[PDB]
């Protein structure tokens, strides 16, 4: 009775995984960013959940299950009750007590550790759960990938020392790598934002897909791998060029953009700069950050600078004019009455053009040292295709990624705030050093399709297929065909395979049945017919296959065993 | 292994709550919100697995529906307001309204509107195992009355009542398979279905003294009903003949059954209680009379057609304006409102009632003679020793923990959210629905409520978190530490769930033993340099009184038989 049950019965879905997940009856919308898992969709979901839980256990983590509803008072200990922003879904109960529906669980698990972790002989320990979160995304979109309710594997490890944290952290990296291999994904772990300049201890796991919202950077020869947020930028040139022009004021009443200098004044874009006035970390101060005309400011690198306020805030036009005496489109490093930091590539420029900090004027032929001192230099830009690999090996390619996991060395941020402390073996109170590890279990189901699909529909990796074999008769009411078919279901089920049986009547044509089984990603099809049973044979076709086959009935069970290998 | 699982009691009053706290199975986050600790999650998953197997074997299809539910769906059924303060409501950042669902009737009916479009897809039975939130006013009893709890909730859809009954019966059978595999002593009982008589609602109850429900059995038949549902028949075959004339008596300080009995030497079976309730017709009142030794069954009262559901008791001001006399002076004689008497009241003779005149009673009232007999109904709770309404035996009342409910819902939601499908002959049909729920969280606690002893938790075999505890005495000795790891592998390879107690010379053997017994592990093996010399392993069962020594080779056989 299987298809007349599992198959059940788009207009806005724009990414392929969302459209296919809806068309294939894997999920359906309830409200904005809230999706029901349909019977066939839940079969795939649980397959993900099984592998992730197996590798978390094999890596020594202890599954727990914490509440969804959480006391605001915990979120007030970390300050995140306010600081988290409008993505936190806040509520009150019938007694006017305040809660959120958790998007994550750092406070709750730290609260647990306060009460449960009392001796150094219990450390290290790593707790994880597979549980529904809520995030009030301002614009839920992309189906399972930017929903509001989604499933998360979130894990939290506690340590007495940095080395202890690293070992567990390394084990999680390895377990994640096992997880996304068993899931049969084309993935890449990359270095990620750790809040600091340089250093380590933050890695993202990405599935490669041309719809990726993350840009991820790779050496074309070395193992270098990093989110563009983190990717160190080093300049292509080896030395600063020599001064070949004098500095001069140029009237620029209508030249206020990189485009206008390059196209209008014919300047090589390598001879232009963008100045970005941001707020200072010192209250009320301004900082000017400068990148070359053909580059962009990396905002994460920007806010990592000690002089720069984190998070990044851009100065207003009125602030800019009050400080500098000129406004956007006429700004530059010369006679700049505010602190400045220039990108590494900008320090090597020569004979370049800058806004003069005089309205409607630029300097042309600026040269560092001759016309003004070089200010502080830092890595402020994003890398671009073909940039040198920062490890000196090869050049950089940028690909698109869907983030499906993140691991992060958290330190003592929560154990300081929530007074989670344990005595070291020598008797010293130690603030527990924490790590956090997350996988977007929901997002994984969708990520797989973004990467594996064709014109016929979903292509599942082997571990995710909701069934392995579809039986399609083809006049299924024929006693001859219904007995061969029902026996075949039993044999194949007996041997352990997961078989979907298409029991729909003649009112559903064979071609439609074929297209349905293909759409839902079932990797093997078997068609039973009286004309083939006469000939003593069975018709086979693979999901990726071009033409069907005919297999002698007697050979079929060995043949399917081989395919499933 | 125990350095990890064991981790390190005040407001706990029922035993399952103290034991779940002390065995490190759960811990509290806030009121009614509890974290499953690693030991606890293992037990809960063993419950879910068994529930899921039997749901699937019964042909139901697992889905997973959102926890946050839009208010507009709840407004279609009227439950957005009607469900009460137990509904957790919120607004998102865009000021749209939702609840955190306590149940999913509207959601699954909404799903069906979009997915059930052909009769060839029916019958169909959807279920999920999913966290609910119910904003209980006074959350208590640990897992038994928390606010967040795990629930297997199922909903089936049908084109005919017969179709529903079949699926309903398979859910009944599957629940029994479930609770049998969970090793519980349960009983299914008839339950309140909304109507007088009839079937279509059964509750599954674990038998325990702490049960909040009263469930009625015959000591002679299979009869089993929630006291809310139990039919009461009188212990009398016939109304007695009149042997007093009716008189007016002054009862100035007589306003309770006890005062009428102890102040006038009347037997309690000659007295009555008159309860004045709101009638279903707007603005009307109905009086409900039971005998002085009985209580009013409020489920039975509300099921009366004249009586408003849910039941509302009349105020004292309302009584006085209607009748002309107050509580404690009420009765059926000269009663200017409609009246319903319990079956037993109808058989009474020579009986006392308030006269509907302040501080007065009639004595020696007799039906037909002094006043006409009103309508008769089954209005009272049964009491221990009552006749069994199937005519086989008398009735006993025991206390039960409700772990499962099945209910024939009909077209309540399909009619309101317009869920209709064309029959094979082309007639539109509102889908008939049944709903089935198992308190998965609650089942864990109900098990301990019925299985425990002086030393801690007793688990039915299917729920034990581990089957074997390895307690190496002096595990720091490398001779014991090798034999035990060797043993851990052998047993884990054999497919047994084994908890190695790796704790050190700090925690004494005696403490280690008590901890393994508290968390309810069925079987223990002690490895020692003592018995290693003798080539022997020490074994003890969780229920046994003495431990015993055991040749090592025989041990793998001995223990596989133990769990057979
Ligand atoms: Mg990111
Ligand atoms: Mg009840």
PDB file of C-alpha atoms in Angstrom, chain A residues 181 213 301 436:
ATOM      1  CA  UNK A 181      31.716  11.652   4.160  1.00  0.00           C
ATOM      2  CA  UNK A 213      25.840  32.232   0.095  1.00  0.00           C
ATOM      3  CA  UNK A 301      39.095  42.318   9.231  1.00  0.00           C
ATOM      4  CA  UNK A 436      30.890  24.617  20.740  1.00  0.00           C
TER       5      UNK A 436
END
